[PDB]
DNA sequence: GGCACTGATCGGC
DNA sequence: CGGCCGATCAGTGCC
């Protein structure tokens, strides 16, 4: 196998600089406002510039303003987003045997036939898609090429921005031997210091646990994920990803445990999220509570048929009223999640 | 036991 | 201090 990982560089903040070229090389920070107050919300991303600051996805944006006050801060426009995102993915399809798109930015190609096996040609195939993903959307990617998903992947990460990452073959065992715990897709800063704690720093050292023992500090899919990649047999398909769920959730005005307050803002979530669904009927619907504190509470219920749009808001009447029961605590955010679709 | 399914959390992008 | 999503996993019912 010959795969092409493909991942674009700070994305949002990246297209924001494409349709505003005024912003390319200084610090800009796309932001997602909550609409509560003038500043409340998140970060999404940031340019180069402005991470190197201090800015960083996720955090606040009051944050991000205390620390880089001259930065542009504007707007997620999240559509246009997704444009973008189409139409590359759409490129990269055409230069694909198969192709599995992981995320809005990030895809996985499986271009094994389509250069007759040969891995240096896979190379040759991976600048040509940069190149052309520059000419025609003005948007630089990091790519990687590797005989499996996870490799391509973890040299594309350690490639950024704008790169070009290579293992072949022959370099893999050398590599997985030299890897380090933290770099590897799936383990989260905090595992990973857990593991970090147990001394095991390297990816080679999980052969030195077997499975009993590492499921204690892992958890079962953490574990036997682990002590294939180490062993070099991960070797996972790629595979056309469907969506599995479709929901919305709104920032409320002020925090509330009132439902006539709160019923509102759910069922504009449920109208959006049924829109979105378009034809697809969920048997499953979550309504999730985001509360004042920032926890997140989640009360479901999966029937034996398809969901209409009105017994959804009935229902979701229902499951905020047994998140209220069960948590004393205020609401901030409220919204609905609608899965296993007919 | 272990399969099928569940509701709820977890955490990455 | 946002707004998403898929993965994960312990609990139940069952034969
Ligand atoms: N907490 C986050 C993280 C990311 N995103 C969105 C914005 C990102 O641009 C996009 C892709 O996430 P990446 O992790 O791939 O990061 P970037 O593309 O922004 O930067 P990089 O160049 O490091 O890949 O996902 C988000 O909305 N919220
Ligand atoms: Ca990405
Ligand atoms: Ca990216």
């Known amino acids: ?29 796309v932001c997602v406002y909550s609409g509560r107050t003038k500043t409340s919300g998140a970060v999404a991303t940031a340019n180069y510039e402005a991470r190197k600051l201090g800015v960083k996805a996720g955090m606040p944006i009051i944050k991000a303003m205390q620390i880089a006050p001259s930065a542009i801060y504007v707007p997620m426009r999240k559509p246009i987003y997704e444009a973008f995102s189409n139409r590359i993915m759409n490129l990269l399809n055409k230069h694909a045997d198969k192709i599995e798109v992981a995320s809005i930015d990030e895809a996985y190609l499986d271009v094994t036939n389509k250069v007759e096996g040969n891995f240096e040609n896979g190379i040759e195939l991976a600048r040509k898609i940069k190149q052309e993903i520059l000419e025609k959307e003005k948007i630089t990617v990091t790519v990687g090429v590797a005989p499996n998903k996870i490799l391509a992947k973890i040299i594309a990460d350690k490639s950024k921005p704008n790169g070009l990452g290579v293992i072949r073959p022959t370099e893999v065992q050398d590599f997985l031997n030299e890897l380090d715990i933290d770099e590897i897709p799936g383990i989260g800063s905090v595992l990973a210091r857990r593991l970090n704690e147990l001394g095991i720093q390297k990816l080679r050292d999980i052969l030195s646990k077997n499975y009993n023992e590492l499921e204690k500090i892992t958890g079962k899919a953490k574990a036997l994920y682990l002590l294939k990649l180490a062993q070099d047999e991960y070797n996972e398909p790629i595979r056309t990803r469907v969506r599995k769920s479709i929901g919305r959730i709104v920032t409320m005005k002020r925090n509330s445990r009132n439902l ?83």
Do not use: C, W
């Not at 092409?4 to 349709?19: G, H, N, P, R, T």
């Not at 479901?300 to 047994?322: C, D, M, N, W």
């Open 1 to 29: 196998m010959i795969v092409i990982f493909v991942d674009f560089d700070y994305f949002f903040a990246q297209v924001e600089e494409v349709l505003n070229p005024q912003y390319k090389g200084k610090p800009l920070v």
């Open 260 to 342: 006539e307050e709160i019923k509102p803002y759910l069922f504009r979530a449920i109208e959006e999220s049924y829109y979105k669904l378009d034809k697809r009927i969920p048997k499953a619907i979550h309504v999730v509570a985001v509360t004042e504190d920032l926890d997140i509470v989640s009360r479901g219920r999966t029937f034996p048929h398809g969901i209409s749009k009105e017994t959804a808001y009935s229902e979701s009447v229902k499951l905020l009223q047994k998140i209220l029961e069960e948590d004393e605590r205020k609401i901030r955010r409220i919204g609905v999640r609608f899965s296993k679709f007919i």
